Design a protein around this ligand. Structure first.
Ligand code: HEM
Length: 147
């Protein structure tokens, strides 16, 4: 759960992160860079490498889903149930076992991609709030994945 101050920050910066492509560019950057830094992850996703066009398609889907979770930060219960459902779906995705450990490095790539787009708006308070928001969102997915 996020405090009211954290919720305020996430909601405000999300508008700038979504920009004019519902966050698709952020999702592309996040995954491309993730796979370039951890080559081993391509096989998990079933991608040929960082330049596989499925990287951009999937990055857009992940960011759109984060937008949905943010719209429900007012009702933690809904956010978590929704993310759990996404997590259950992951039971049938990928070519390698999807492990909880993979989520941490993905989170770093995501926060970096957000910063690359909004710059200065990703201040100390935004970095703290987004790390907590990502921990709740990824935590809920993992709970469904592991159920
Ligand atoms: C390292 C962690 C991750 C891995 C390995 C994983 C992998 C996958 C794969 C292989 C696909 C399916 C493409 C096709 O349908 O076969 C997918 C779909 C999806 N992923 Fe994940 N993903 C990860 C993290 C997450 C995160 C953190 C989110 C959201 C917060 C998420 C949201 C989605 C959604 C929305 C789609 C589209 C399909 C549907 O809605 O079920 N993914 N993921």
């Amino acid at each position: 759960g996020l405090s009211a101050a954290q919720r305020q920050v996430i909601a405000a910066t999300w508008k700038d992160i979504a920009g004019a492509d519902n966050g698709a560019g952020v999702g592309k950057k996040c995954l491309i860079k993730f796979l370039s830094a951890h080559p081993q992850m391509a096989a998990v996703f079933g991608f040929s490498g960082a330049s596989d066009p499925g990287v951009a398609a999937l990055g857009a889907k992940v960011l759109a889903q984060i937008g949905v979770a943010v719209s429900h930060l007012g009702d933690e219960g809904k956010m978590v149930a929704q993310m759990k459902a996404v997590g259950v779906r992951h039971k049938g995705y990928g070519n390698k076992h999807i492990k909880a450990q993979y989520f941490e490095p993905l989170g770093a790539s995501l926060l970096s991609a957000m910063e690359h787009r909004i710059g200065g708006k990703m201040n100390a308070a935004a970095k703290d709030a987004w790390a907590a928001a990502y921990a709740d969102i990824s935590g809920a997915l993992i709970s469904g994945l592991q159920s």
